[PDB]
Design a protein around this ligand. Structure first.
Ligand SMILES: *[C@@H](C)[C@H]1/C(=C/C2=NC(=C\c3[nH]c(C[C@H]4NC(=O)C(C=C)=C4C)c(C)c3CCC(=O)O)/C(CCC(=O)O)=C2C)NC(=O)[C@@H]1C
Lengths: 162, 172, 162, 172, 162, 162, 172, 172, 162, 172, 172, 162
């Protein structure tokens, strides 16, 4: 997908040229941040269920109608609660993928393209998922530039949902 | 296009899986040899005209039939197309070296090269000699000290050698 | 001109997007290298006249005919000689600008674009200038990655002339 | 487009000069603040939707005239275009802030804005109020701490305050 | 604005030709249905405030949280309640306009173009407005083909939102 | 073939949308006028040979030279007379076809496209055929709006030739 | 492009008003005269070549300097361009009659037609006589009965007369 | 693209025949059922999003492997492409119903759809269940009264049923 | 207009180049035939009235209806006969212009572009003018390559009218 | 495209040879007949409309089937396309006759004609009859004298008879 | 574009006149000096690189400010643009010489050159020196015997001198 | 390749037209010159080895370093010398082909296209080849327009190298 390394190769290839020291400096920027990014990805994978279940109950406490109101698209059913937690798990998993390739490539490719359409079609509200994402920001426990890395992609998702 | 990090990501997503810590330790290992990888690519990126022209002169000294009247590298248009192809290959091998993965190479450069040379009447065999010459020249340059700290690059030259061999083999 | 930073801005701007973490990593890689680059530029600027004089002397040693063949495009004249040392100074000055911005942009804009035509029309051989760049490479006095930065842009000029 | 480094270089070329130690030293100082600069821009990049919606809501609370039937932000097409221009000015201030130079702001964006809003009948002064509100928001967030080492970003805030006013003055 | 007459003129003009008997048969189809259409516009206009107030109250009974949750995009404020009523009045107005010209053009020009962006940005839910239109549909009082007409445009609106 | 129904489908399809109430009002305009149109086709078909023979004889009385001048493109030959009668029968046929589909499409597809080139090449005069259509117009016998219909297409034909 | 109905809707939205009953009853009158207006444009549409050529003959018979060597309708390219324009004008007048509004006329045709002719050196006044001729010819034809029902079309004739004068005025 | 009327005209011209009275009386029957067919497509056109999403929900509830990781409707891009296709099919069926002929269906949609899905690895059979679902949903809706006059639409329902099966068959 | 010399200049200029010996050979071909072409032009100008009046009576003897049949577009009126001879004079004058620039440029520019339109519009028959052109071929009195030159452009006109 | 001179030159280059005196002498002979050649081509160029109309009339007199309702030359669009292809084959034989080589005929025209008429349902044998008739006409006129010095053009007629058969054989 | 023969034709047509025998005798005079005209143009066409480079070296020896850092011919892009312009001018002067008329020159090359150089900051004065240098070099070459028969070309060099002066004057 | 004849065919063919008298004049100009051209080619082919040997000797006299400087791209070797005389033979052979077809086509196709790249990459100076073409020009032994034809194509090669 789009990553810092494939973008350098695409910019050079379009121009029919060998990579320049500008592109090599670019890839070095990625190798320099990458240790912060893979460590943030480890802590997020290790606490994956805690973050998914906590975020989903953060949404149910802020919007209690989603657990009470009848219909296929709310969390009033066992199934509905399972799909809602499954969707939150997709945002967290795409975030770890963005941390290991160092670009928003996976989230854009696997989650963002088509999202407005499926959300309007199935009447899923962006506001529900902004609550889920804020909860996982607030208690992943990361600090320093490890936190800075994970929050940059978590905030990206919030701006895609506006 | 996929680099090493996106290939793993793409395999995990089909399985709906988060990457495991061993998978993460393997990517941490790549990031560890990154400066050496950057040095490898910069020695090709800095000697590219020498590598293509010197490997071309050796090919035509070995196979002079190529430049006789009627040969597939005779006339300026064909000699220039030939030197250009040798450079397209050397570029895509440097891209795959930065990517740590051959998909760039297979997909853009290599896809149907046999069909094209075959159709044009170009000797795939002679193109393979041209790639093998560029591989020896480039492997010797990647291991020269001056401007760079002495250490072991044995793993990286085994890896560019494989990309060069992939290009040599996809032309017939 | 293209520098790492303007290239990052242009990539996001063509997509109608704010910079992402990909570009921030990119620019960081430039701030990392930039200390080696500016140091390379200081020593290259401070030894400019010695490197220009020695480089000119080195192509007259490898190509003696250049000072004996009559005509406006050889160094047989005092003007022939002043024009030749001037052109070698242009190659050194443009290389310090590449060092300062971290891209080949200034040498591309101010020297490579249009070079084939002027050398053809004035009958100036690229070989003469490759011999001068090699001399500078071989004796600018730098070490480690400061040397590695100088050498990358002097090698770029050699590859432009083949 | 020029950044802070290419601007100095283009002036030296026009004089035919190598850069001075003063100039080199001045550019080393921008490189030293590089990490603070990337944090300023990431704060804007991270809060971009909030910064134009909150600043747009504030504007329509003050100038309700804009959204009444017939007003310039009335109809979904016109509102969507007003929010879009707010976001465009934020992007170009981001760009100016990463480069350390006003160039991209002036040539790729403000060139013709006064004239365009005039011909269109868009009220220039209201656009200037929207930019002032986005400025207030953006300086606030650039000073927030969490995931950032504490220190002084006083100069970068004065510098980004300049880019917002440049943009606010180009509309009337 | 796209009306039946304007679409017929634009097509003939696009092919550099005078209108054909086909375009005249299509403008005849508008003139024939129009009587139903102006009856429907006239009644819906006369019952505008009843329909707006009742439709607003239908949304708040179906989605009570919008009356209780704090913040500018809900109905828990005097301003919020006014803006919500205002928005439903905008939908009813554009529907009477579509009836007067025989096409969705007024609604498309004035309301559909830009909607997605403003409802994402202000976090307004399409489901709220669908509830409003369903209420207007269920009690404008019209019958036979005047009802047929008003419902085709009120359902167009719901399909824009679904 | 361009008919009212086909033009409505092609437009909606061009914009990737379902048909609108506008396109439904236009197909209603065709269905409303069609009764006149099929009456006219039916009568003109039943009086085809009278109308063809009489129209042929109208041309030869107005332009007697075509009965007297030698050579293949005139009516001074058995073959020439047959081909002339044949051609006028082609015009009447395509007019009944336009009446059945509510558009000039059959006539345009089958007869207008290519006409100029064949009448230049075979030196056939447009004035001969205009005389034929004027005769059919003046004595098909129809009245009121069935006459209105048949004359719009017979005059279309004359405008193609003028 | 606006038709009669859309022009009113447009005015009411800029004021955020629903259409009044007066405004509604007024657009019901136009739907009442539908049949007649369709006959009106059908009569022009079916005599289109005759209206242009007969009117053109009359113009050149009155102003023979137009077709003399060096005249602006001399050579086949210029004459063809002149017959084409008369037809363009007759087309937009047919459209303005169907829309019931002068907007398509003014937007898609009459705009800039004065330097279109002024820069070209084309006599605006001769173009104006052509439109007069076409008007006379078309008002005559709109009143012929045979295949249409007899009644009063004085209303519609004053309407086509305005649209013709509109066109004639814009070029002069 | 041919509608019912044009298909007959086309056949008669290849034989150089005028249409017979039988053929004429037969096309008079379709004009008689005009009103109903317009209601039929209006009912689909006004419930279009509901027919696609409800039918889509049912498909994924019966075949949950389509939305599991690695499934062909997993990720937002693939799901969006799948909802889009169901809508494309419902659109061409609405057109075939208005034309009264299957030609637009076969020409502008059903053609090549088997390797469009076969090369992609898309299950033709699942696509076929989607169309079945949409058919069931649309036949139900075509029979609802409220704002339309009651009568017999059995004829038209057998017609939409054929068009749906036509589409469903072409992909499998 | 298009002449052998402006075509050589356009072919070279499009390619951004100086004229080649290919284009100089081309212009020499024109200078070589030109004496035959200007002599043919002198004899045709000298006999201009004889050729115009003779050709017009050749048309009236072959097609006598054009002098008898009533209406603005026939030679039954004094005016009509004057316009018909004027039109034949245009074909002869454009032919002398083609002979002096050595290309069909003037006839294409001044007479052929637009011709089908004005001829269909004013119901003028191409066959009338083919008779006029054949008459002037048959008695201009030229021989050898002078005749060959004038006939090549006279025949060009007949093929434009088919 | 190659003419008779470039064809010899491309063969010599492939062998790396200068042309022989024999070859040079053979090309001098084409130059000696140059004026006769230009007359042959001007005769075709001068009678081109007559040659395809007269040859088309002859064909439809022989094969009336082509123009009956349903036949491949029936409808004005199909007839106009048949006359057009007749004229295209005449142009390319003209071109082949000026160049002295079959190249332009074969690559720019006959490449795919058999296949195109087959897929289209155009009867190849009838096309071949049309070309034979145009050949007969064109050899007749090439021998007419008037404005031409009398002599023997026997070889140029045999040569143009070859170009017509090449074209007649490429359709079936 | 107009050559000498088409200019007269174009003037006569506006007057509806056939050319007179004196007008024809004047064109016969041009055709008479044609071989000399061809020789004039071929000496420019054969020495074009020498004429531009040698006239450029004299300009920069005279005006060295042009090549100092910051001068309008400093950097390779501008030196190459300058040599390219000198060649565009020398091409258009050779075209006008073949045409025997300046319209090619005025219309394509010269139209707005002052506005362009003025806008770019190029010294129109220095461009004029460059043209005058090309005029002296080219006039000397047109009069060299070797490969060409000795005779009088005084009229032709007065005519290229005028075209060169026309270019020099339209730049300011 | 481009010759006068293929260029004439291509011009008419791009307009979908038969050749006009313009092109026939064009081709005639080629048949006129062609006698001088083929004669130039006969004497140039018959003195080929003398002109190649003498030309090679002439660049080694003007540029003595070419036979003393070590390396594959100089004439210091026996292979260096055979390659140099071979390349001079290519320039003479291509010039006789230009003579035979009357266009620069064969030298453009077989030698100019791609020349800048090979000379750059193999470090071959254009000046060396300009000295060889000048020698051939100066002593091929031809007179009048046979000489004028030879010289035009040898001067074309010099201008390609500047
Ligand atoms: C085989 C390829 C080489 C070799 C390479 C080594 N390079 C080592 C260190 C090193 N290389 C770089 C340069 C690189 N980084 C960049 O960011 C850029 C481009 C923007 C380049 C071209 C860096 C910065 C370093 C310096 C480390 C330091 O501060 O000292 C190195 C040591 C191991 C490692 O650090 O990865 C080696 C072995 N050594 C060889 O002997 C050959 C010829």
């Amino acid at each position: 997908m789009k990553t810092p390394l494939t973008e350098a190769i695409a910019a050079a290839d379009s121009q029919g040229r060998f990579l320049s020291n500008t592109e090599l400096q670019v890839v070095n920027g990625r190798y320099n941040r990458a240790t912060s990014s893979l460590e943030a990805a480890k802590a997020l994978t290790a606490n994956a269920d805690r973050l998914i279940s906590g975020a989903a109950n953060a949404v149910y406490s802020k919007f209690p109608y989603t657990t009470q109101m009848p219909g296929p698209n709310y969390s009033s059913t066992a199934i509905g609660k399972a799909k809602c937690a499954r969707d939150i798990g997709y945002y967290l998993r795409m975030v770890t993928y963005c941390l290991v390739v160092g670009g928003t490539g996976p989230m854009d490719d696997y989650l963002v393209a088509g999202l407005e359409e499926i959300n309007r079609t199935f009447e899923l509200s962006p506001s529900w998922y902004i609550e889920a994402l804020k909860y996982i920001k607030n208690n992943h426990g990361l600090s320093g530039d490890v936190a800075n890395e994970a929050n940059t992609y978590i905030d990206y998702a919030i701006n895609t949902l506006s | 296009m996929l680099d090493a990090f996106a290939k793993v990501v793409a395999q995990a997503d089909a399985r709906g899986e988060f990457l495991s810590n061993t998978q993460i330790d393997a990517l941490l290992a790549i990031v560890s040899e990154g400066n050496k990888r950057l040095d490898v690519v910069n020695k090709i990126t800095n000697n590219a005209s020498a590598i293509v022209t010197n490997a071309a002169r050796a090919l035509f000294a070995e196979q002079p039939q190529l430049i006789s009247p009627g040969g597939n590298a005779y006339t300026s248009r064909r000699m220039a197309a030939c030197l250009r192809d040798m450079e397209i290959v050397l570029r895509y091998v440097s891209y795959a070296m930065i990517a740590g993965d051959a998909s760039v190479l297979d997909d853009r450069c290599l896809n149907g090269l046999r069909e094209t040379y075959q159709a044009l009447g170009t000797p795939g065999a002679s193109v393979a000699v041209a790639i093998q010459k560029m591989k020896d020249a480039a492997l010797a340059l990647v291991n020269d000290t001056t401007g760079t700290p002495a250490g072991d690059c044995a793993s990286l030259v085994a890896e560019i050698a494989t990309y060069f061999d992939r290009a040599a083999a996809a032309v017939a």
